[PDB]
Amino acid sequence: GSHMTQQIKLLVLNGPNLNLLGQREPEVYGSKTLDDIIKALTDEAALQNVALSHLQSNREYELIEKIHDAFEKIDFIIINPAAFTHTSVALRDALLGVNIPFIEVHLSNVHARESFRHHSYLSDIAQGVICGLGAKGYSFALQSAIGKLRNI
Amino acid sequence: GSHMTQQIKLLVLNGPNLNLLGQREPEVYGSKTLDDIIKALTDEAALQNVALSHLQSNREYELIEKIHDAFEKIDFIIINPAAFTHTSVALRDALLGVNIPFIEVHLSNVHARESFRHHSYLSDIAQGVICGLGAKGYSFALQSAIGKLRNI
Amino acid sequence: SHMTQQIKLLVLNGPNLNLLGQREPEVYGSKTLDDIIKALTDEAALQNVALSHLQSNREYELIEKIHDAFEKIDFIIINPAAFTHTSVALRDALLGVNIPFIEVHLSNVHARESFRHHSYLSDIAQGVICGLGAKGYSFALQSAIGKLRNI
Amino acid sequence: SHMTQQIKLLVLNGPNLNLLGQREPEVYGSKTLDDIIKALTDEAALQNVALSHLQSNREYELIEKIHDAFEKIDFIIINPAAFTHTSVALRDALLGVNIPFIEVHLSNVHARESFRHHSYLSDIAQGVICGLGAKGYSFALQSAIGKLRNI
Amino acid sequence: GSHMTQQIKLLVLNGPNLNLLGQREPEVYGSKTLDDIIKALTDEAALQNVALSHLQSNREYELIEKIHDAFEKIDFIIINPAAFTHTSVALRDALLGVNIPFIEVHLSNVHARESFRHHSYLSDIAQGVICGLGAKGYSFALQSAIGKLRNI
Amino acid sequence: MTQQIKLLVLNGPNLNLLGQREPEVYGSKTLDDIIKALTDEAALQNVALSHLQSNREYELIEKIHDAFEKIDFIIINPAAFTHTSVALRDALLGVNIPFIEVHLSNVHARESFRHHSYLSDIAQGVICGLGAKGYSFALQSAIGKLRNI
Amino acid sequence: TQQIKLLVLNGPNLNLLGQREPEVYGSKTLDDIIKALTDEAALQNVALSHLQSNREYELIEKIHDAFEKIDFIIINPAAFTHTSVALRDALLGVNIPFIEVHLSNVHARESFRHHSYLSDIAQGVICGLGAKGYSFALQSAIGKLRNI
Amino acid sequence: TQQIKLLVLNGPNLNLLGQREPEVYGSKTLDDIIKALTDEAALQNVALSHLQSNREYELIEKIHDAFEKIDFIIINPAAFTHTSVALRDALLGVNIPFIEVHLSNVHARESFRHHSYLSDIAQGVICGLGAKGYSFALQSAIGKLRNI
Amino acid sequence: MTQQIKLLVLNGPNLNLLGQREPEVYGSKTLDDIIKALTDEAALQNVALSHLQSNREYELIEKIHDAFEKIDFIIINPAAFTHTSVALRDALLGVNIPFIEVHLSNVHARESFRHHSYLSDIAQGVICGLGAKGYSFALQSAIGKLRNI
Amino acid sequence: MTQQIKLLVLNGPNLNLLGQREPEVYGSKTLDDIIKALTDEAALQNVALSHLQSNREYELIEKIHDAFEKIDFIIINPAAFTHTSVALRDALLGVNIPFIEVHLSNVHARESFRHHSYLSDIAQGVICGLGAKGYSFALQSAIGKLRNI
Amino acid sequence: TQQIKLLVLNGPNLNLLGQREPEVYGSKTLDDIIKALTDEAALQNVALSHLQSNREYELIEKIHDAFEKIDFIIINPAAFTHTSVALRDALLGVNIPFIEVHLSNVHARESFRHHSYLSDIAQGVICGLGAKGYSFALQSAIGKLRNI
Amino acid sequence: SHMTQQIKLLVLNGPNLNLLGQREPEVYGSKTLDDIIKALTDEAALQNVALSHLQSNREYELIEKIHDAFEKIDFIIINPAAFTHTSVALRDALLGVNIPFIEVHLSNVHARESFRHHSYLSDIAQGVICGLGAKGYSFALQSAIGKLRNI
């Protein structure tokens, strides 16, 4: 506690369709964009000596290749795989292959939606899972990650 | 009926392997190419004041990103997702995210093929589904779409 | 129509389709089964297709009409309605007379209860149309003409 | 805290959570349920949230506390522990009083036996946190404040 | 047997995450890289008048498009689809569309791993399947392919 | 003063056999005996009760179509058709008359194929196992629903 | 007539009847239903006793106490219908005939509500007919016990 | 011997036997099979009656009419084997013993044809042996009724 | 004049117990009685009928291998092995002799594990529930198939 | 000389009914009779045997919590709770006392919902079907495990 | 007492007990367990006979030979528990009561080991308690046969 | 072969494999089991592998041979044929003697009936070869040599 902390390098990965946040019927579904969420999250992290990086993609390969590039360079991942949660064994195997701990986040409550959304190829190997709490879910994952890495 | 119609903008999306149409054993499986089908369909649409656009891809992301780019620009989609019908939740979520009505088409009768082909991530949110009627399926979807948008 | 060989096509409609247009027409639609068949028969005749029709709430009347179609009808368009999910006997009647057919549904069965997702006909149909309303019968007619004339 | 309307929040903990910190603390952890609730109550008070708590191994005490919360509590945070997988009665108590809630688990249920993968609460919760240990209750508190104050 | 053989053109396809071979904890999981395996395999093939080509990708489309480009140019495929074995109907349909015989290989024993890894969209249409025998699996597939094409 | 209610009772296949075989074992009451009693009970509360029993699915479907805008409530025991007839479900939905499903026997005590009904989810409610009084209970429920008592 | 002793058992959450949004979900309380049913029974020389509880044990222990004291049970186990093998085995152990009643049509609700641990051993089941279901169960019990 | 009265019931589509591509699927018609079977029965003092129908009700109503009139039933329900609970309950209701017969081997066909609503309550089942299956069922019925 | 048919009857485990326990209850007929009668019936139609019953799966498999090019038709009651032995299925496929599956009891009236057979889909046909006459029916069917009568 | 063993027997719902109904049919032995006999058998081998039977799941959970660091071994018949109570599984795991699961009846001969136990995989072992002696067998096993005999 | 004749049957691979890594998996051999059990039985005037086999037929044929000769069977079918309908039908055919025993807790092992072809027709089942399970089965058999 | 320690390898073949090459050899193939084993034994000997073989239609002969292999055999290659899908006893024999093995099938089981898709051995095998015909045994031999010699 008394010493300066070591910088944590944390990567946030977002999957398909999350670039649409804030676009359709904003008076109904909300006005906050993904860029707004990540800007806020990057500032929150920087006040705790965390250098937060981000990629969102509709391209599964961009997410896989970014996980590979994270090897021995990133301390922790926060991932919202979106639709690829239910379909991508390749993302599971990238995360197991680089051995970086991660937390799974969803804006929506997947358990209140169709039954196909109730199965995740990541949840069993995640440190934990947050769903249904909106944009704050990313901040909760960041808080969890800092506490896990610094034992606080 | 008495007034000039408003132009309809319709996008046709084709998924993987449909670029192979007409290539293998044409005396056995048929000589018509996908370009032949789309040329004919584009002319059929133009005679009814429909501007028909098209993308075929083996790249799921190209299809997702084209759906995103369609937002507030396209009135209706006709999609043959091919193999991605059974696998792509991301395509389901792109179509729900942009809120454009669509019809699902297959050249083959999926119900006569393997059991994995009997489930579609699109069929329940499509306006309707055509399968097994070959290339004419696209024309039937176009006819349906014009009637739905112009109430005829 | 003149240069072509006449096609003989039978349309079969299952139970409850006689109710089309009856209840809350402002809500569920005004068009009757008679209206759909009149229009379809006119469309067929202009392409040298002689179109016959039977609708029934009696499974046997559909089976027996299929038997009577043997060596007399080129193509069948069938909306079996609720019998789609229940009638093995209709499947075996169609297999027994070996006439190609298309399955049509007005509604999108895939958007409805899971018991409607299974058909005893879809695997042996030439193809299936669902969810496009009454134009689905015209699409089936168009498809049948193209198949039998190679056009 | 001053400018805000006070929130009344109830935390409910199910069976066996009273054992936290008791067995092999060097191995499974030292922190007790009392330690988690003391900290959580202090965190709530600084944001003008009055936080009440009940833990029980008695399903009825949880049901009856939910009934007593009607028209008196704004939000519930619940870790039903083993009752997550078994108690339809707790589901119906929460539906019956119509208070929004968040489900929390210390452990990652998805990493454990398949019977723990099913919850009678998760579909009607506002959301679910699992696997993040005792900070999950604080995350649920943060979420509840943001939802009720639109912040 | 007495005549010179006709050259066989064989394509090896590798799916996602196989580029990680040899990288993590090599004293534990092994030091051999995918490039090491393919170099050895290409030399083994060249001594039997087989011209062996290779693509590994984390991009499903690169694998699909390479299969399409193989049409009437390649005699046989060896494929380790990795995670896409369990998920990609599109790869199944590319291989059926070009009608090139193939053998499925896995370094790991998929039957000893999670139940989702027990189903393959390729195994029923492969000539055969090798799993669990490590890098030699590719050599066994090559040996099998030569014998099938030359009737030896 | 009450407005007359018009109520139709529909009985499916094999219920015409009630009372016929080994009456000392399975009971002596016939379907005609149940319906005569029920028609009298209904008449005392200004309900005009009509009845069809059939082994012909079509006769039940066609009767339901003919009931449109003419009948206030249906009591149906579809017997074996409860587990097999989607067409009866769709007839009842298509005419939009409220109904109650009744079975003399406790279907939940019988083979597992009898545990599912194509009508139970869209019925007002379901009565099983209580013998012939179940039709009386259904009649009482229908009167209370239509007259808000 | 010989007096019949009949016990009505109600499971969890039925104490909430009539409390929330009464203009929407209904004004009748469980006490209203039981007071009416107790009167209906007393006019036919039936002594009707009642227990509603959110405590599974209270219902089990009441069933044990009914042994050789009660002629018939009417039970709405509410959520416990789908979960309590212990209630099934309490009813089988005391061998008192019973009818299962639900206010709501369980078949119209989620699939987990389609299965009952009691329905196969009940005399019969009534669902979806609201509070009159308890009256129909009482009528059925009288007819069975008095052969009328 | 005492005369036996035996009813043979045939379900849907069996009227098509012998009609389509006879060089491929066979020339024997249902009338050919039944005329032969009626003669085989008459030589053993069995009066054999027959109904084939595509109408489920005709088969149900024939079974009701058989009550206390017929000693044994042979039934090939064809497609109705897999679908008709009503036929099962008609046979259980009149309590006449019966054998189930199919011309084709249902076990070699699609999985929905593997389940019968009649097989568990039949005396026995014959499938796949063609038209001789009806003769074997007749032989079995004679042996059961005359204890031979 | 007919050509002689050579037919092998195979019986699986526990069928040697026929007739032994509580004969007044379960029957007095032994397997030897059934086979002696069947061998006589076959001989009258110029069929040479051979038999093996075993509790040893291998004795049945090895007999089927030995039948190759020597036996025209098999009648098999695999008893418990019907539900468990893929190896018997593959023996029969490997020698390509037509066969009929017979069971004395109605397997469809018994526990659900008895409802599946590794032989029924590749048999010419299946007879169950008709007691010892089922072997006679199978013999009649085999004669008719081989002689086109 | 042996060290005393402290052993707790837990009995779940409905076992208080043992011996009550139709004793000429279902048996006359009461739970009190079984426990008195078992307590005497344990005392002869320097085992102090305590007991709770309850229809209240919480009384069983709370007793298991109270056993922590005070009891060497548990014998539990959870009765109906065997098939329903994850909370009892988690109580037993949380105090880490070895246990044996016992049932008087053969659960495998009863309805399929009785075939699954939330305790059987984490028990030392399971005894079913052998009546009241099953508690004696569990006691013998516990003595042998704790004393390595 | 009247002498009881009791047969113990052991299935495949139980001959390996005590062979591999005895410091890890245990030193007791099957012959050690059976010699002790034979002595325990002989002190109670039980004649105990034993067969262990990797040959399914040897166990089936031994059960047939037990008919009217043996009062009770204790069986650990090992792998055959999950696979052998033939063993079930041998035990049902000779109608000798039996107890099923496993050394290991099958419920803690793979899901295919959770199902037994014998458990529903056994008198009872013992698993997970090691070699003492055979003694408990012997104690149970004595009590049943002598009403003690 | 000289510089290496000799490997002792056992090949086990299940039921019906004795029929290889017997029926319609022009159609299903001419090569016999004896031909495969002669060739395999020669291939082994050139790499200082002493190869023993048993084929049987008797499950017990396979079980007992596995028991007899304890502390005497380095590696097993097994084609259990139909017993792959049925024999828990063979699984437990191999687990009981703790000798590593490879499962081989001539045919592609995944292309055949669904009951052939499940193996009681595949999860505990070092690996599995199917569909490659008789060369699969040679591939298994090659794999075993590389594993035991670290080459």
UniProtKB/Swiss-Prot annotation, chains C, D, L:
One GO process term, biological-process aspect: chorismate biosynthetic process
Annotated substrate binding sites: 79, 85, 92, 106-107, 116
Reactions catalysed: 3-dehydroquinate = 3-dehydroshikimate + H2O
Lineage: Bacteria, Pseudomonadati, Pseudomonadota, Gammaproteobacteria, Alteromonadales
Annotated site residues (Transition state stabilizer) in this chain: 23
InterPro entries on file: DHquinase_II, DHquinase_II_CS, DHquinase_II_sf
Oligomer status and interactors: Homododecamer.
This protein's name: 3-dehydroquinate dehydratase
Family: Belongs to the type-II 3-dehydroquinase family.
GO molecular function, one term: 3-dehydroquinate dehydratase activity
Function, in words: Catalyzes a trans-dehydration via an enolate intermediate.
Pathway: Metabolic intermediate biosynthesis; chorismate biosynthesis; chorismate from D-erythrose 4-phosphate and phosphoenolpyruvate: step 3/7
Enzyme class per UniProt: lyase
Keyword Amino-acid biosynthesis: yes
EC code(s) of this entry: 4.2.1.10
HAMAP family for the chain: AroQ (MF_00169)
Origin: domain of life: Bacteria
Active site: 28, 105
Keywords: Amino-acid biosynthesis, Aromatic amino acid biosynthesis, Lyase
From Swiss-Prot, chains F, I, J:
Keywords: Amino-acid biosynthesis, Aromatic amino acid biosynthesis, Lyase
Enzyme Commission number, as recorded: 4.2.1.10
Pathway entry: Metabolic intermediate biosynthesis; chorismate biosynthesis; chorismate from D-erythrose 4-phosphate and phosphoenolpyruvate: step 3/7
Residues forming the catalytic site: 26 (proton acceptor), 103 (proton donor)
Gene name tied to this protein: aroQ
SUPFAM superfamilies the record matches: Type II 3-dehydroquinate dehydratase
GO biological process assignments: amino acid biosynthetic process; aromatic amino acid family biosynthetic process; chorismate biosynthetic process; quinate catabolic process
One Pfam family cited in the UniProt record for this chain: DHquinase_II
Annotated source species: Psychromonas ingrahamii (strain DSM 17664 / CCUG 51855 / 37)
Any GO MF annotation of the entry: 3-dehydroquinate dehydratase activity
Protein function: Catalyzes a trans-dehydration via an enolate intermediate.
InterPro entries (alphabetical): DHquinase_II (IPR001874), DHquinase_II_CS (IPR018509), DHquinase_II_sf (IPR036441)
UniProt record similarity statement: Belongs to the type-II 3-dehydroquinase family.
Domain of life: Bacteria
Catalysed reaction, written as an equation: 3-dehydroquinate = 3-dehydroshikimate + H2O
Residues carrying the site annotation Transition state stabilizer: 21
Binding site for substrate: 77, 83, 90, 104-105, 114
Record's protein name: 3-dehydroquinate dehydratase
From Swiss-Prot, chains G, H, K:
Pathway of action: Metabolic intermediate biosynthesis; chorismate biosynthesis; chorismate from D-erythrose 4-phosphate and phosphoenolpyruvate: step 3/7
Keyword Amino-acid biosynthesis: yes
Site (Transition state stabilizer): 20
Domain of life: Bacteria
Keywords: Amino-acid biosynthesis, Aromatic amino acid biosynthesis, Lyase
Annotated active site: 25 (proton acceptor), 102 (proton donor)
GO molecular function: 3-dehydroquinate dehydratase activity
Enzyme class: lyase
Keyword Signal: no
Documented EC number(s): 4.2.1.10
Short name of any one Pfam family annotated for the protein: DHquinase_II
Binding site for substrate: 76, 82, 89, 103-104, 113
GO biological process, one term: quinate catabolic process
Catalyzed reaction equations: 3-dehydroquinate = 3-dehydroshikimate + H2O
SUPFAM superfamilies named among the record's database cross-references: Type II 3-dehydroquinate dehydratase
Assembly and interaction partners: Homododecamer.
Function: Catalyzes a trans-dehydration via an enolate intermediate.
Family note: Belongs to the type-II 3-dehydroquinase family.
Alphabetical list of PANTHER family matching this protein: CATABOLIC 3-DEHYDROQUINASE (PTHR21272:SF3)
Protein name: 3-dehydroquinate dehydratase
